[PDB]
From a paper:
Three types of filaments were observed that were made of two identical protofilaments arranged in different ways. Filament structures were determined to resolutions ranging from 2.3 to 3.4 Å, which allowed us to establish their identity as CTE filament Types I-III. Types I-III of CTE filaments were present in the frontal cortex, with only Types I and II being found in the temporal cortex. The three types of filaments are molecular polymorphs consisting of two identical protofilaments that are linked in different ways. By cryo-EM, the tau fold was identical to that in CTE, SSPE and ALS/PDC. This is the first inherited tauopathy with the CTE fold.
Dominantly inherited mutation D395G in the gene encoding valosin-containing protein causes vacuolar tauopathy, a type of behavioural-variant frontotemporal dementia, with marked vacuolation and abundant filamentous tau inclusions made of all six brain isoforms. We used cryo-EM to determine the structures of tau filaments extracted from the frontal and temporal cortices of the individual with vacuolar tauopathy. The ordered cores of the filaments span residues K274-R379 of three-repeat tau and S305-R379 of four-repeat tau. The CTE tau fold differs from the Alzheimer fold by having a more open conformation of the β-helix region, which contains an internal density of unknown identity.
Author numbering:
A (entry chain F), B (entry chain B), C (entry chain E), D (entry chain A), E (entry chain C), F (entry chain D): 305 to 379
Write the structure that this text describes.
Amino acid sequence: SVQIVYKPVDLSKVTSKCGSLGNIHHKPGGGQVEVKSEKLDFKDRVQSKIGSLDNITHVPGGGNKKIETHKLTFR
Amino acid sequence: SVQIVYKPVDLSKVTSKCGSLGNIHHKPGGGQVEVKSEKLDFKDRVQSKIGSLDNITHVPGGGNKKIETHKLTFR
Amino acid sequence: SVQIVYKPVDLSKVTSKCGSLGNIHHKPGGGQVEVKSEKLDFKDRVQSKIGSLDNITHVPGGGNKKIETHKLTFR
Amino acid sequence: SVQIVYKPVDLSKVTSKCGSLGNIHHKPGGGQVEVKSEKLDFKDRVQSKIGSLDNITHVPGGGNKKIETHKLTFR
Amino acid sequence: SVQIVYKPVDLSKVTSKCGSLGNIHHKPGGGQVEVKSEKLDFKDRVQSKIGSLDNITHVPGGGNKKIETHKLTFR
Amino acid sequence: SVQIVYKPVDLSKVTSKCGSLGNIHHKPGGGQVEVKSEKLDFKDRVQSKIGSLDNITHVPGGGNKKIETHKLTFR
């Protein structure tokens, strides 16, 4: 016979405290961008991106992450 | 016979404290960018990116991470 | 007695010839401009200019100048 | 008695010839400009210029100058 | 008695010939410019210039100069 | 008695010939410029210039100069 008892006990705290969060500045791509092309040949697919793309400013007041995984596998 | 008892006990604290968080400046790509192309041949796929792309400013007030994994595997 | 004879003779030619004049590009001030000011005191006059000012593109097809001065002064 | 005879004779030619004039590019101030000021005191006049100012592109097809001065002074 | 005879004779030619004039590039101030100031005191006049100012691109197809001065002074 | 005869004779030619004039590049101030100032005192006049100023690109197709001076002075 088989007796399996799973008792994870968790009283944990991922925590933060901040008095003031501010005066943040993200300025990507302030310079000038110039692209000149003459006489090109493409025989397959083309992807182009030109300018200021996919810039992120992420300012979470908290920003706490807790990841927990439980696997109980029985053969 | 088999007796298995799993008792993880956790009272942990991942924690932070900050009086003031600020005066942060991210300025990518302030200079000028110039691209000139003449007489190119491509016979396969092409990917191009030109300018200021995928710049991140990440200012979490807290920013605490806790990762916990439990595996109980029985054959 | 006094005899004064002034005979300037001029058959001159300031001249130009141009087959094609073109494909000219003047781009001042393509970059980004940022001005932040806190807690200033001025006790006299102030002049400020901010941005793209007084840029000239001057493309005279001819552009020929002839300056001629005659002074005949008699005491 | 006084005899004065002024005979300047001029058959001169300031001249130019150009087949094609072109493909000119003036790009001043492509970069980013940033000015931060805190706690200044001025007790007299102030002049400020910030950015892209007084840039000239001058493409005269001809551009020939002739300057001629005649002074006949008699005491 | 006084006889003065002024006979300048000029059949001169300041001249140029150019088949093609082109593919010229003037790019001043492509880099980024940053100016930070704290706690300054001025008790007299101030002049400031910041950025890309007074840049010249001068492409005269001809560009020939002739300067001629005649002075006949009589005491 | 006084006889003065002035006969300058000039059949001179300042001349040029150029098949192609081109592919010229003037790029001043490509690098980044940074100026930080704290706690300065000025008791007299101030002049400041910061960045890319007074750069010249001068490409005269001809560019020939002739300077001629005649002085006939009589006491």
